[PDB]
């Protein structure tokens, strides 16, 4: 079993950023790659074939710290530490517009994959902004008393998964602008909240080097905590590590501060992989949304490793 | 890949010698971190 995929090599090292990569996301058809990095740039690659850097997007005045794709994969969504959001066009390589209204650094954002289009930005002033991707003004914003480093949209499109430095996952409702309930249990600062593809589990990695999976389902006990996977210690930097799910919801991949991306089995809690290959901390560990065994790990070695899981 | 996690999680058999760095004084490997983190810890 040498190689079972469509890449022309079992490993590919995408390089060309002059600064640390913080996020990298796949096109929801598993075909296009976008990586935003602290040199204020979004580099756009192909994943299948010779994998050329077909595009570069400039226009952010500070470090880029998130980006999601659209429904089709034609409009990119970049949050950046210049207190701004931005919607970008990939037909021309230009920028559609910028979204303004935050006062401090923006750490998270989320686009509603199905439902109605909303951008959800968590920002260090203590705010969760809900934006429509046609008008630059904020449709709404929810006020907290702590910085927000993590944000996810519910399957039903009205609950917001905030995670702050106050050490607990908070689920808010958009209509009442108030918290529904808090899954507490973490000890350190939350970094990523990614919903399961079927929609009943939530991944959450915090600065305490533990990644926990929680419940989403409306019928659940008082403690919604399913499991506390361990085995990915966090390094020297306090980066915002971004984990993800596989397509089948069976494998949990989270980067770690030793340059290794760690994959557990989400069903039982067994370390499936501990893949090395990076020098500094691994910031964004993602799966292929199509279901192929392709994994991507973008790390602050200014690099991305696109590899296989055979 | 050298399998998945089974051969990464096991010890090599046998006892050690009763009887690998690169620098004489120790071991040094290159790394990339943000310069602000280094400045913060230095300060």
């Amino acid at each position: 079993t040498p190689r079972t995929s469509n890449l022309k090599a079992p490993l590919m090292e995408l390089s060309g950023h002059t600064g640390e990569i913080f996020t990298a996301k796949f096109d929801p058809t598993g075909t296009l790659i976008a990586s935003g990095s602290m040199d204020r740039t979004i580099m756009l690659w192909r994943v299948y074939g010779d994998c050329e850097n077909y595009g570069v997007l400039n226009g952010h005045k500070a470090a880029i710290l998130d980006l999601q794709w659209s429904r089709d994969g034609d409009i990119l969504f970049s949050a950046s530490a210049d207190m701004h959001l931005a919607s970008w066009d990939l037909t021309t390589g230009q920028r559609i517009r910028r979204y303004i209204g935050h006062e401090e650094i923006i750490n998270a954002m989320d686009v509603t994959q199905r439902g109605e289009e909303l951008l959800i930005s968590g920002s260090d002033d203590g705010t969760i902004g809900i934006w429509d991707p046609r008008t630059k003004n904020a449709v709404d914003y929810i006020e907290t008393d702590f910085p927000i480093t993590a944000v996810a949209v519910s399957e039903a499109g009205n609950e917001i998964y905030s995670g702050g430095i106050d050490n607990d996952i908070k689920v808010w409702d958009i209509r009442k602008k108030a918290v529904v309930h808090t899954m507490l249990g973490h000890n350190d600062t939350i970094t990523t909240l990614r919903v399961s593809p079927d929609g009943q589990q939530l991944l959450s990695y915090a600065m305490d080097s533990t990644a926990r999976t929680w419940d989403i389902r409306p019928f659940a006990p008082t403690d919604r905590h399913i499991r506390t996977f361990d085995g990915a210690p966090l390094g020297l930097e306090k980066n915002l590590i971004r984990g993800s799910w596989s397509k089948d919801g069976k494998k949990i991949a989270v980067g770690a501060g030793d340059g290794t991306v760690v994959i557990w089995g989400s069903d039982t809690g067994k370390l499936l992989y501990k893949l090395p290959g990076h020098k500094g901390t691994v910031n964004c560990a993602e799966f292929a949304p199509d279901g192929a065994p392709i994994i991507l790990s973008a790390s602050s070695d200014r690099t991305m490793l696109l590899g296989e899981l055979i | 890949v050298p399998y998945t996690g089974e051969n990464l999680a096991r010890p090599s058999y046998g006892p050690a010698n009763p009887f690998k760095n690169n620098v004489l004084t120790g071991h040094a490997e290159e790394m990339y971190i943000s310069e602000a983190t280094f400045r913060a810890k230095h300060r």
Binding site: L14, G16, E52, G55, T92, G277 | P2
Partner: peptide
């Protein structure tokens, strides 16, 4: 008007295995 950037793609290896 997507201009081609300075990125390159090189096959590589994941290096030495790391202890748990």
């Amino acid at each position: 008007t997507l201009t081609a950037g300075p990125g390159v793609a090189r096959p590589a290896g994941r290096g030495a295995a790391a202890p748990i």
